[PDB]
């Protein structure tokens, strides 16, 4: 489709727009095998200021393949253990902060702004969109800070897709354990408003 725009104002750009993002759509899948990480596939809308997430997730414990939906809503997360029997599980941040992903100092504009030796490989049509396919590494710091089971050591090799057109969004991010093993996360909707209210829960609470 062309020639490829230089990937450093594109990085820069979706830093400060990351940076911005208040929602979004994210799809979350993990390759292979992270240690410390059950997640095999999740999807939903996140809102930040108030934390507010919505969506469903596909998990491994044992050898049980666990579908479930999720909410968290006013700091507490709840999912069904049973098709549309919501439970409560305390506070969300005891598992997983999700406003953590979208976090302007620690979240994803700080993967992009320690996004090192960007180069960009080429061209992926993500949602009917043009992105341009980006390599570079993520300091160690910046990847466990978003994602603290990762437990980097040192730089990880990292893929990011920004929207080649209009306000270059981060289309999708990779990062890459070594061997095939990694975590992508593809993000849509940017600025969404995100509806969550407290999901039902029987009177006996």
């Not at 750009?13 to 990351?18: L, M």
């Not at 999708?172 to 593809?186: E, F, H, I, Y």
Request: hydrophobic residues 40%; aromatic residues 6%; charged residues 15%.
């Amino acid at each position: 489709g062309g020639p490829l725009p230089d990937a450093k104002p594109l990085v820069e750009e979706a830093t400060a727009q990351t940076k911005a993002l208040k929602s979004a759509h994210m799809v979350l899948t993990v390759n292979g095998k992270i240690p410390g990480l059950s997640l095999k596939t999740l999807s939903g809308d996140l809102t930040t200021n108030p934390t507010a997430a919505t969506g469903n997730w596909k998990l491994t414990l044992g050898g049980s393949d666990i579908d479930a939906d999720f909410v968290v809503f006013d700091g507490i997360l709840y999912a069904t253990l049973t098709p549309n029997q919501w439970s409560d599980f305390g506070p969300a941040a005891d598992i997983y902060d999700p406003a953590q992903v979208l976090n302007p100092d620690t979240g994803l504009a700080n993967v992009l702004a320690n996004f090192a030796d960007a180069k960009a490989e080429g061209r992926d049509t993500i949602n009917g969109q043009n992105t341009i396919r980006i390599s570079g590494k993520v300091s160690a710091q910046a990847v466990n800070q978003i994602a603290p089971p990762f437990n980097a050591t040192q730089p990880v090799p990292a893929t990011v897709w920004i929207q080649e057109t209009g306000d270059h969004q981060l289309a999708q991010a990779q990062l890459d354990r070594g061997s095939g093993n990694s975590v992508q996360m593809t993000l849509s909707k940017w600025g969404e408003k995100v509806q969550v209210t407290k999901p039902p829960v029987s009177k006996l609470h």
